[PDB]
Amino acid sequence: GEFQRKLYKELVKNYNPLERPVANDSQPLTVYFSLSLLQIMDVDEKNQVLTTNIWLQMSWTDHYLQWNVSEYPGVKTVRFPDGQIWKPDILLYNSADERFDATFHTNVLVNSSGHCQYLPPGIFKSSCYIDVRWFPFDVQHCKLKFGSWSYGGWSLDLQMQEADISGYIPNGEWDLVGIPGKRSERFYECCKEPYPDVTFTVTMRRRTLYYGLNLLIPCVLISALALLVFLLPADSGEKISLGITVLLSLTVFMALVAEIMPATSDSVPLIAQYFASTMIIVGLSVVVTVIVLQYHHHDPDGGKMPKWTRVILLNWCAWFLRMKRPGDPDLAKILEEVRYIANRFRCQDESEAVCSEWKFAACVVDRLCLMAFSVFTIICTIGILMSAPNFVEAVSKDFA
Amino acid sequence: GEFQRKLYKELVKNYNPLERPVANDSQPLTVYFSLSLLQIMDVDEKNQVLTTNIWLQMSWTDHYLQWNVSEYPGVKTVRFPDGQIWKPDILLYNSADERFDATFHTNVLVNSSGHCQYLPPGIFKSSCYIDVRWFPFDVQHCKLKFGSWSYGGWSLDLQMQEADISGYIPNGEWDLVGIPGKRSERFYECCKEPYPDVTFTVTMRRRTLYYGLNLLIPCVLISALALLVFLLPADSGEKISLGITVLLSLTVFMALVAEIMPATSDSVPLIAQYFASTMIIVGLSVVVTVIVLQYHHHDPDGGKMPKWTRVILLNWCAWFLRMKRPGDPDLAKILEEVRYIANRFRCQDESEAVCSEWKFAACVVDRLCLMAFSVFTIICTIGILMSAPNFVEAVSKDFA
Amino acid sequence: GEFQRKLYKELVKNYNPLERPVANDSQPLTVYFSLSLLQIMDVDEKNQVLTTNIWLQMSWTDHYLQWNVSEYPGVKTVRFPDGQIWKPDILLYNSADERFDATFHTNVLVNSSGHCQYLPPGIFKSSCYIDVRWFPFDVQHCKLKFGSWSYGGWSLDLQMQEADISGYIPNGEWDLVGIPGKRSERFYECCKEPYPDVTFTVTMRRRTLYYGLNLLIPCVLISALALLVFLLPADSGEKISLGITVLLSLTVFMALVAEIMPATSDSVPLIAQYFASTMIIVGLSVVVTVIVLQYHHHDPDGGKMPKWTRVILLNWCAWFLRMKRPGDPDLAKILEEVRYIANRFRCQDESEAVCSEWKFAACVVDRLCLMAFSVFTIICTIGILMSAPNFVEAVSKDFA
Amino acid sequence: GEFQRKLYKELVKNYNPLERPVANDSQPLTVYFSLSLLQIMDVDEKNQVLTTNIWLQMSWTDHYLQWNVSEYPGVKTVRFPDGQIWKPDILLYNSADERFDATFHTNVLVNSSGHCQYLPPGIFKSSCYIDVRWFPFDVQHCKLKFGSWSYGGWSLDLQMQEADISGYIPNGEWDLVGIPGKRSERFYECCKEPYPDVTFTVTMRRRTLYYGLNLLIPCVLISALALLVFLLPADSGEKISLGITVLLSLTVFMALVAEIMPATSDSVPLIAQYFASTMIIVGLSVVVTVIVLQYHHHDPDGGKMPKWTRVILLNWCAWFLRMKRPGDPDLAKILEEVRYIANRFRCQDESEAVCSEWKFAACVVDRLCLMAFSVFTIICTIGILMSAPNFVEAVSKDFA
Amino acid sequence: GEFQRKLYKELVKNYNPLERPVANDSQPLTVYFSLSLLQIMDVDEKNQVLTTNIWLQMSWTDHYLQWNVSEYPGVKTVRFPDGQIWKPDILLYNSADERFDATFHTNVLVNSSGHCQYLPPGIFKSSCYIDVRWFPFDVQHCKLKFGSWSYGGWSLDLQMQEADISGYIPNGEWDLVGIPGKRSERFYECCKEPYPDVTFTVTMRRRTLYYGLNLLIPCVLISALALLVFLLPADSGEKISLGITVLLSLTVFMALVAEIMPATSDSVPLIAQYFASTMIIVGLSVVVTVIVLQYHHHDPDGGKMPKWTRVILLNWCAWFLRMKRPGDPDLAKILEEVRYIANRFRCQDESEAVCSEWKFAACVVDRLCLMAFSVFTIICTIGILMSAPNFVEAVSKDFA
Ligand SMILES: CN1CCC[C@H]1c1cccnc1
Ligand SMILES: CN1CCC[C@H]1c1cccnc1
Ligand SMILES: CN1CCC[C@H]1c1cccnc1
Ligand SMILES: CN1CCC[C@H]1c1cccnc1
């Protein structure tokens, strides 16, 4: 259109894109900054990197891009590309992207009264501190720091508008609690001028259904299966095999799965604590299995039972568990020979009785250890899980 | 040519690439937008990222790029590169690429009557919601949202043309069901102007041949082989080894293959449910194996069976399964000694008979458990698989 | 030089880089397109992406870049950079690179008679269909489609010259069979103008030495050592251990190694078929081992051998395999007592006689199944391998 | 503003961005270079790559960008983008990024007296030598070398200001010791001119809580559990199983975990030394277990022990460990026959006694080797861990 | 300064960056090309990609960039950025980066007599053929080809200066042997003009301390521990378990670690050959263990030993190994009964003697095969290691 073309010709006349568009130079320029979050595309615990897809909202009044709509009847808004009009140098301070600016420079809508608008999208990659102490029931606060790079408080009076999450799409792993913001002024060793900034904190809670179903439940079930080593009769040579195979499976599990955790040293993760507790339980189970096998395979001539252990293990533990406690010269020479045979048989029977008593003591120790270990692992797992905060509310929100 | 050079000289005379080419500024500009899908290169279930090779189709009428062919006899079409003529700022709203615009800016052909065409290719990386509840028999709908970034409904009246899949090449993993689309107008908190957009939904079904062959069949086969623990005679100490080895192999299979699923918590995947069912079956098989070994290795002097279990396990289960149920003074002192030997032998024989009865009870329990577990696992696998919709048609298309 | 500088000044005068350099605008411009394959950098079966390092070759006559060498004695060729002269917009249609154009824009040589040359290099990433049905003995045909983007048949008459592989550096994995090319005209729904293109098909054969040494041989050898379960005497209980451990090793092998295959569903790959056959063989070997152990550990009082199985297993299989088939009152009651002990011993002897017959039957079944499984695995492996085409020629080229 | 626009117009009049802004060309230009470390985002031991978020600080006096504020009442500072004013070509010499320069070119603040300021951020990726001889208790010194690329001592007199870590955020894995630096002049084979540079050395210490908890503790515990093979009674048959399973688990652990060490050959890492010691201990334990099983399973008729091993193993080791040491014609023919039976029984008892003495000797060796191996492993692990320097202080800082 | 600004104004007057700066156009331009290798950042055996950080050195005489220093007292050197003065289009022919030109375009210094200098750095990624036949003791020669892209011999007379490695920082993994180069002229099918090039060959040797310590030693030790299967007494059922577990661990080791070799078929790598030999040794050991178990568990009623094997295994091998070779009517009916009992006992003793002889033969076979296998494995490992060239010098340089 003739009017649009003439207005475009007259609008850039004597216009310098480097100049701050203010009628009075001594007065600061007010820029309203906001944010429009859409997706928490990825959060990387190991690298402490937050990746989001957001739209930055900026607005300011331009003193030179004004016209009377009566003289230009058809046009009411005009769009300027990058590098043709002044734009704020608002940057993400704590950006982790290889190129510092991840915004996609788009056009700039302009009022008929000089008011401007700027909505550059972009995949923002910010470095936020990630806490894994209460993993996976942790609540993460990551901060997005936005502020003008080379404009101070006397020049660009940055202002805050509430973040908009109307277009936000739910993430399958993280539940958003809110995105509050704050505006503050900081001094720098470079210069004697304040540099106001707008910081948006992203509070997200991790959904624990997948992790609880894939890590906690299988490991708890395998630990409960490890207790089966104490129900295997000692006569079958499979207790050691079962215990060591369970331990090998679990030690493969921890190293293979719980490696996505960052190599931080701020504190021990809850999952690490619980894996360590399970490893201790399984190792002590193997130790007790070795002790039980040592008691079971005792030589009758190796040594009699000591009085204290004999009396305690055959009276007190039996009472507690209600275990059942088992239990012419030719004739002369031929008689002597058969007497020898029978005496040897009697000695064999006495040795067998001693061995049976040893086996009973071993089985009693085994049952007592099974009960104690089951109680210990139940209480330890319950306490470890309940130690983390927001555990009950997380379960109520996820499983219920 | 002289005519072509003169027309190029006269075409850009007083031409502003920022101006919307409309004869009447108060009227909007009609832009026909379409899409030409070529390949679904990659869909990332874990990353919720879809990657496709597509060509965007845009066409609009330019009021300033017109000429009389009679005055330029040889030329009929001209091409302008990027940044020399006005082009719609149509962008992919839900882009997941590091740079928002993935299009490759190509030349722009022009009619002799001002009509234009624009066919920029590009590797579009859009973020779509990926549902894995019915994996691998899931049907996925992902939306590609296209619309002008800075032009509203009063300026750029975006229209729609049906997507073209004539050049589409098939994927070896996903079967296209179609690419429908819709045009809608929505408001934004920025401005009081509607912004029409065109959204193309991609409906793709996953081909399940590879997954069913490489995950389902091996796991069902190994679960069926785990039932062999109940056909092993208890006299050989290998039931526990077989069971624990099968369980370890299955837990490695799970934690090694079922990891490409995203860590979502919307719902439990079907494959996760079926792996959990298989894990429960194998664990309970190990528990029953320990029970059978406990029954088999019973001390004769430990205690007789309770009459209830004796009668039930020796009558009812035997009848149901048609089990076969097995079964001077020198002479005086020599007499007493052989009497003692024979009495000891008779006691040994009766103890052996009791032990054999215990072994029979253990074997009968084992067989009953084998039958029950086979029925349970068959019905559970069949039900879990048949629960997912479109299962039968997926099989008919893939295997048949 | 003065002459060179003057010629450069006069050559750009009134030159428009957007104009097609033709004396008669109605006459199409002839562009000779060729390719210079240098390397096959990488071919990605999983992602269906081919990566090559090639030099495109273009040649066309320019009407405006001509001069008389008599007037410029010293200069005979001139080079222009990108964006200063007209260049064909020849693009790789089926490109899979994040940016569509992977070429590196270099200078353009010019004759003293207007003839031009343009050889841009680049790492080209094309989406070619990869067939893994006969993996690893497959022959892959991948197509590189080149053609002008915005120029039709009435404007840019593309012509094909034979591809040059003179500087081709052989790859250590793939053997180049040839790079034939073809030129065709195809229509588009946009426009009523043909768009000639040049398509180069890359026929490469996979060298199978590495794959046959690292995958086929170890799996065959592991199956051969899994057949050893049928040579272990049943009295020693490690048959189940050996069989299950070999099955575990093989199921780890297949999952860990045969994962570079794409998740395609066009057809079952040969390596997948062979792995499935090996899995079936090992699982059936475990089943037969369980059956053999069940026959070996049979209670003598459990039941006599059925007549049919007894006669056939002790006559027909023995004949076939030529197996060896094994085999005052005081005195009165002392008589009665010794008679009792001897009768018990005789019954005992009959008991181990029956047990030895059972063990012989189990061993005969074991040897028969060993022979059957050996012959079956041999014929299955040979047939599966020889089913794929070009097997013999591939072996003759690689190993011989 | 009118004053701002006029000043911008007059400031770039006759200004060449290529010219070094100095009043006297013969005098060098003083540029104060500093650094503002913000985060140690990632260090790559395998790739010898350091990644940090830093802000470079540069300052210099410009003789052409000066004005009298009395003539421009409102403006006091002006900002110039890249490419419009002269900037130092200060580059990171040892950069490991695909593009050599990673700085984000930002605007340039300017005084009212010509003084300048330049604060370009960037994700700096540098190649620093990484020493793993004391892993994970190592202290790393990586050098960042900054200096002008094409300006010498006579032209650009680079000066140094102390690095600022006021805005530094702690890293969860590395504890910063300090960031000292030095300025030096070094010559080049190209040119007879010094090129002063500023080199910042980053001294970081690795926090060892995570590594000590996840690698040292599990491996020490597994090694301690490997000694349980010596407490297993020899009558049971799981000693070899336990030993070989522990060795397999440990080698799987080492292969899967100690792979993020770089493949350097400068020296053997401490973790590699300790893993090798553990592997040697476990292998020698398996050898000792084989020897003990050979001693335990000795045929009585195979031959009596040598007198030397007899006396030593039954006297000296027993004393040291205080182990208990176990321990008408018809009548004639009937006597002869029963005498035969009894003599055979006596010979059997003699052989049994010899075998029991063999078992006692085997158990004595087993206990002695258990004690020796426990002492050896404890001293070896303590010595290896204490060999690394700063071990005590690292433990005190992390665990205490 | 005024002089510097005036010289900058006068230097670019009538200047054309496209023009070759030569006084006589017919005469070629002499460009001195060199290289300053700094670091071998990474070499990719699998990808056949060599990554180095180098500085390119170029120098040429410019006819138009000359001035009299008397007229410009202060300035003596000037710097031009990219695109303002003519630069050689020297490119890396065999590049592998996604963009062909990986150099960073820095400033260009100029003499007071027209002599120029150009030092563009960059991370150069070149495709070099990598030979893994003698891995890890291989010596790699990779070629970096540099030459003018669009300038021939008649125009740009390229000259070579020796590569500079003064600034080289030694790599931990690879030892530099030297970087010699050559200059040659090649003809291309495009043009009838020679195109001289400079090719630098990088001769690098791999330091083998890490690989020898982490692959060769563990596998040799594991094979030596697999040889322990022949010292286990056959009475303990653990030979099969030990052998199969070692084979499983080794087959995990190979497929898990020796995967960074490329899938090349030029020749079998030394490490692959050694792994194949170890696998064959372990499999044959398992076969021999199965044979020994078959001999040990022989039914005495199965059949007598063949005379040949009896005599050879009891005489020749025993002599060679010096193995010890073990070794009124009532009275009548009581006589008959006791005679029966004793006759059965004598038959039992004869059977036991036959079984003991079988056990002796099995043990002798076991010891003989142990000796043979130890000798075979030691000779095979020594020979396969010594086969590779530069083995002794690599050992002397690394371990000594
Ligand atoms: C607040 N700004 C952003 C970081 C430093 C500071 C600054 C000061 C002067 C010139 N550039 C940047
Ligand atoms: C519809 N457009 C795209 C997203 C927001 C909106 C918009 C409005 C004004 C200026 N830029 C963008
Ligand atoms: C041949 N070109 C490449 C693909 C389609 C066709 C085309 C048609 C119109 C405008 N641009 C491209
Ligand atoms: C100090 N500069 C940076 C590295 C080399 C040196 C240099 C010398 C001459 C021309 N360019 C660079």
CB contact under 8 A, E276 and C252: no
Residue type for position E29: L
**Strands laid side by side in the E121-127 sheet:** E121-127, E49-59, E29-44, E156-160
Write the secondary structure of chain E as one string of H (helix), E (strand) and C (coil): CHHHHHHHHHHCCCCCCCCCCCCCCCCCEEEEEEEEEEEEEEEECCCCEEEEEEEEEEECECCCCCCCCCCCCCCCCEEECCCCCCCCCEEECCECCCCCCCECCCCEEECCCCEEEECCEEEEEEECCCCCCCCCCCEEEEEEEEEECCCCCCCEEEEECCCECCCCCCCCCEEEEECCEEEEEEEECCEEEEEEEEEEEEEEEECCHHHHHHHHHHHHHHHHHHHHHHCCCCCCCCHHHHHHHHHHHHHHHHHHHCCCCCCCCCCCCHHHHHHHHHHHHHHHHHHHHHHHHHHHCCCCCCCCCCHHHHHHHHHHHHHHHCCCCCCCHHHHHHHHHHHHHHHHHHHHHHHHHHHHHHHHHHHHHHHHHHHHHHHHHHHHHHHHHHHCCCHHHHHHHHCC
Number of A/B CB contacts below 8 angstroms equals 186
Option in B42, B75, B121 nearest C25 (CB): B75
Starting from the CA of residue B194, give the closest ligand.
Answer: 2
Residue C399: other Cβ atoms inside 10 A = 11
CB C175 within 8 A of CB C205: yes
CA C363, CA C352: separation in Å to the nearest integer? 16
Strands annotated E in chain A: 29-44, 49-59, 78-80, 90-92, 108-110, 116-118, 121-127, 139-148, 156-160, 174-178, 181-186, 195-206
Q: How far is A399 from chain D (nearest CA, A)?
A: 31
Between chains, do C333 and B335 touch, taking CB under 8 Å as contact?
yes
Closest C-alpha to ligand 2, atom 6:
B149
Q: How far is Cα E26 from Cα A158, in angstroms, rounded to an integer?
A: 64
Nearest Cα neighbor of B200 from B130, B131, B147 is B147
Give backbone dihedrals phi and psi of E50, rounded to 5 degrees, phi first. Answer: -110, 125
CA angle centred on B236, ends E252 and C295, rounded to 5°? 110
Range of the domain at C32: 2-207
Question: Which position has the token pair 């994995």?
Answer: C173
On whether both A233 and A348 belong to a single domain, the answer is yes
Count helices and strands in chain C by DSSP H and E runs: 8, 12
- The enclosing domain of A148 has a CATH number of 2.70.170.10
Pocket test for ligand 2, best of B150, B184, B192, B197 (most atoms within 8 A of CB): B150
C-alpha to C-alpha distance for D136 and D391, rounded to whole angstroms: 10
Cα–Cα distances (Å) from C47 to B137, B208, B259, B334, C262, in that order, read 21, 18, 19, 91, 7
Helices marked H in A212-328 — which ranges?
217-226, 239-257, 270-296, 307-311, 317-321
Question: CA-to-CA distance for E121 and E102, rounded, in angstroms?
Answer: 9
Shared domain for D243 and D385, answered yes or no, is: yes
Q: Find where tokens 């020198």 sit.
A: B330
Among all chains, which residue has been given the structure tokens 């722009």? B108
Give the span between the Cα atoms of A163 and C176, in whole angstroms: 58
**Same domain, residue pair B256 and B343:** yes
Residue located via tokens 């590189």: C144
DSSP string, C80-144: E-TTSS----EEETTB-SSSS--B----EEE-SSSBEEB--EEEEEE------TTTTS-EEEEEE
Q: How far is the CA of A225 from the centre of ligand 4 (A)?
A: 68
Distance B5 CA to ligand 3 centre (A): 24
**Residue reference for tokens 């002289």:** B2
Question: Are residue D200 and residue D227 in the same domain, yes or no?
Answer: no
- Reduced to 3 states (helix: H, G, I; strand: E, B; else coil), residue C66 is coil
Distance CA D119, CA D105 (A): 9
Among the partner-chain residues E77, E121, E331, the one whose CB lies closest to the CB of D100 is E121
Chain A contact set for D225 (CB, 8 A): 247, 283, 286-287
Structure tokens at C248: 């575990």
Regarding whether D216 and D172 lie in a shared domain, the answer is no
Write out the H or E segment, with its range, that includes residue D361.
helix D329-387
How many Cα atoms are found within 13 Å in the side-chain-facing hemisphere of B211?
A: 20
Domain boundary among D207, D236, D265: D207
CB contacts < 8 A, C to E, total 188
Is the same domain home to B267 and B338?
A: yes
**Contact partners, residue A365, CB within 8 Å, separation at least 6:** A288, A291, A292, A295, A313, A317
- The residues near A391 (Cβ < 8 Å, ≥ 6 apart) are A137, A385
| Residue with CA closest to ligand 3 atom 6 | C149
Length of chain B: 400
Same domain, B202 and B81: yes
Inspect the interface and report whether the beta carbons of D341 and A344 lie closer than 8 Å: no
The conformational region for residue B252 under phi > 0 = left, psi -120 to 50 = alpha, else beta, is: alpha
Check whether B15 is labelled as a binding-site residue: no
Check if E117 has its Cβ closer than 6 Å to any atom of ligand 4.
yes
End-to-end Cα, chain A, rounded Å: 62
In sequence order, which residues have a C-beta less than 8 Å from that of residue D78 and are 6 or more positions away? A18, D7, D8, D11, D65, D110
Last residue of some domain: B174, B206, B238?
A: B206
Q: Do B236 and C241 touch (CB under 8 A)?
A: no
In angstroms, how far is CA A122 from the centroid of its own chain?
A: 26
What residue has token string 């990605």? C44
Q: Which residues line ligand 3 (CB under 6 A)?
A: B 109, 117, 119; C 149-150, 188, 190-191, 195
Residue type, B175: D
CB contact under 8 A, A225 and B286: yes
SS3 per-residue string spanning chain B: CHHHHHHHHHHCCCCCCCCCCCCCCCCCEEEEEEEEEEEEEEEECCCCEEEEEEEEEEECECCCCCCCHHHCCCCCCEEECCCCCCCCCEEECCECCCCCCCECCCCEEECCCCEEEECCEEEEEEECCCCCCCCCCCEEEEEEEEEECCCCCCCEEEEECCCECCCCCCCCCEEEEECCEEEEEECCCCCCCCEEEEEEEEEEEECCHHHHHHHHHHHHHHHHHHHHHHCCCCCCCCHHHHHHHHHHHHHHHHHHHCCCCCCCCCCCCHHHHHHHHHHHHHHHHHHHHHHHHHHHCCCCCCCCCCHHHHHHHHHHHHHHHCCCCCCCHHHHHHHHHHHHHHHHHHHHHHHHHHHHHHHHHHHHHHHHHHHHHHHHHHHHHHHHHHHCCCHHHHHHHHCC
Interface contact flag, A108 B150, Cβ < 8 Å: yes
Distance from CA of D14 to the nearest CA of E (A): 9
Q: In 3-state terms, what secondary structure has residue D379?
A: helix
Same domain flag for A201 and A219: no
DSSP states along C336-356? HHHHHHHHHHHHHHHHHHHHH
- Residue A114 backbone class (left: φ over 0; alpha: ψ -120 to 50; beta: rest): left
Count of residues making up chain A: 400
Q: Which of B42, B104, B166 sits opposite C47 (nearest CB)?
A: B42
Q: Work out the burial of residue B102: count CB atoms within 10 Å of its CB; fewer than 13 is exposed, 13-18 middle, 19 or more buried.
A: buried
Strand ranges (E), chain C = 29-44, 49-59, 78-80, 90-92, 108-110, 116-117, 121-126, 139-148, 156-160, 174-178, 181-186, 195-206
Distance from C-alpha of B120 to C-alpha of B90, rounded to nearest angstrom: 11
Q: Which residues contact C66 (CB under 8 A, 6 or more apart)?
A: C112, C113, C114
* Cβ contact, residue pair A127, D41, below 8 Å: yes
Residue A188 in marked binding region: yes
Integer Cα distance of A101 and C178 in angstroms: 46
Identify the CA nearest to C374 among candidates C238, C259, C264, C226: C226
Chains within contact range of chain A (3+ C-beta pairs < 8 Å):
B, D
Question: Tokens at residue C165, please?
Answer: 């592989």
What is the phi/psi pair of residue B105, to 5°?
-65, 115
Which of left, alpha, beta for E316 (phi over 0: left; psi -120 to 50: alpha)? alpha
For residue C112, how many other CB atoms are within 10 A of its CB? 15
Provide φ and ψ at A196, rounded to 5°. -65, 145
- Beta-carbon contacts of D12 under 8 Å, excluding residues fewer than 6 positions away, are D84
Residue from C36, C106, C208, C225 to probe the interface with E (highest E Cβ count within 10 Å): C225
- C123 and E16 within 8 Å at the Cβ level: the answer is no
Q: Nearest-CA distance from E357 to chain D in Å?
A: 11
Number of domains in chain E: 2
Q: Are residues E123 and E56 in the same domain?
A: yes
| Strand ranges, E, within chain D | 29-44, 49-59, 78-80, 90-92, 108-110, 116-118, 121-127, 139-148, 156-160, 174-178, 181-186, 195-206
Compute the distance between CA of residue A291 and CA of residue A279 in angstroms, rounded to an integer.
18
Contacting subunits of C (3+ beta carbon pairs below 8 A):
B, E
Please tell me if the CB atom of residue D188 comes closer than 6 angstroms to any atom of ligand 4. Answer: yes
With a 6 Å cutoff on the Cβ, whether D193 touches ligand 4 is no
Identify which of E231, E257, E256, E246 has the alpha carbon closest to the alpha carbon of residue E283. E246
* Lookup result for tokens 């095979």: E380
Same domain, A191 and A247: no
Cβ contact D73–A98 (<8 Å): no
Nearest residue to D250 via CA among D205, D283, D219: D219
**Shortest CB distance from D345 goes to which of A265, A268, A344?**
A344
Taking phi over 0 as left and psi of -120 to 50 as alpha, with beta for the rest, B156 belongs to beta
User: Do E225 and E298 sit in the same domain of this protein?
Assistant: yes
Q: What are phi and psi of A318, to 5 degrees?
A: -65, -40
Query: Roughly what angle, to the nearest 10 degrees, separates helices B217-226 and B329-387?
Result: 160
| Matching residue, tokens 């001999």 | E295
Q: Whose CA is nearest to atom 4 of ligand 2?
A: B149
Last residue of a domain, one of A174, A207, A240: A207
What are the distances in angstroms from CA C355 to CA C297, C304, C341, E300? 8, 10, 21, 14
Q: Which two tokens stand for residue E173?
A: 């993994």
Residue B29 and residue C118: Cα distance in Å, rounded? 40
d(CA A149, CA A95): 13
Pairwise CA distance, residues E70 & A354, whole Å: 117
Q: Mutate which of C191, C193, C197, C198 to test ligand 3's pocket (most atoms within 8 Å of Cβ)?
A: C191
Tell me which residue of C353, C216, C324 sits closest to C271, measured CA to CA: C216
Rounded distance between C-alpha atoms, residue E146 and residue D154, angstroms: 33
Which two tokens mark E23? 């006084």
Q: Which of D216, D206, D167 has its CA nearest to residue D53?
A: D167
Q: Which amino acid would we find at residue E156?
A: L
CB-nearest partner of B106 from C150, C256, C263:
C150
* Distance (Å, whole) CA C93 – CA C55: 16
Q: Which residues in chain B have Cβ-Cβ distances shorter than 8 Å to C247? A: 225, 249
Residues B86 and B20 sit within 8 Å (Cβ to Cβ)? yes
Residues of C in contact with B330 (CB under 8 A): none
Residue D208, C-beta contacts closer than 8 angstroms, at least 6 positions apart:
A265, D136, D137, D394, D395, D398
E strand or H helix at C394: helix C391-398
In this complex, the residue of C91, C265, C294 whose CB is nearest that of residue B233 is C294
| Spatial separation of the C-alpha atoms in residues D294 and D302, rounded to whole Å | 12
Method for structure elucidation:
cryo-EM
Contact criterion met (CB < 8 Å) for A262 and D172: yes
Q: Which ligand is nearest to the CA of D146?
A: 4
Give resolution, Å, one decimal: 3.2
**CA E292 – CA E361 distance, rounded (Å):** 9
The Cα A242–Cα B229 span in angstroms is 14
- In testing the pocket of ligand 1, which one of D115, D119, D164, D168 has its CB within 8 Å of the most ligand atoms? D119
Q: Which residues contact E171 (CB under 8 A, 6 or more apart)?
A: E39, E40
CA distance A71 to B239: 95
Residue C6 near residue C71, CB atoms below 8 Å: no
**Cis link prior to E28 (omega < 30° from 0)?**
no
The angle formed by the CA atoms of residues D261, D265 and D270, to the nearest 5 degrees, is: 55
Q: Please say whether the beta carbons of A282 and A247 come within 8 A.
A: yes
Q: Would you say C282 and C230 are in contact if contact means Cβ atoms under 8 Å apart? A: no
Give yes or no: residues B333 and B349 share one domain.
Answer: yes
Structure tokens at C359: 């063990």
Tokens 């064999």 correspond to A348
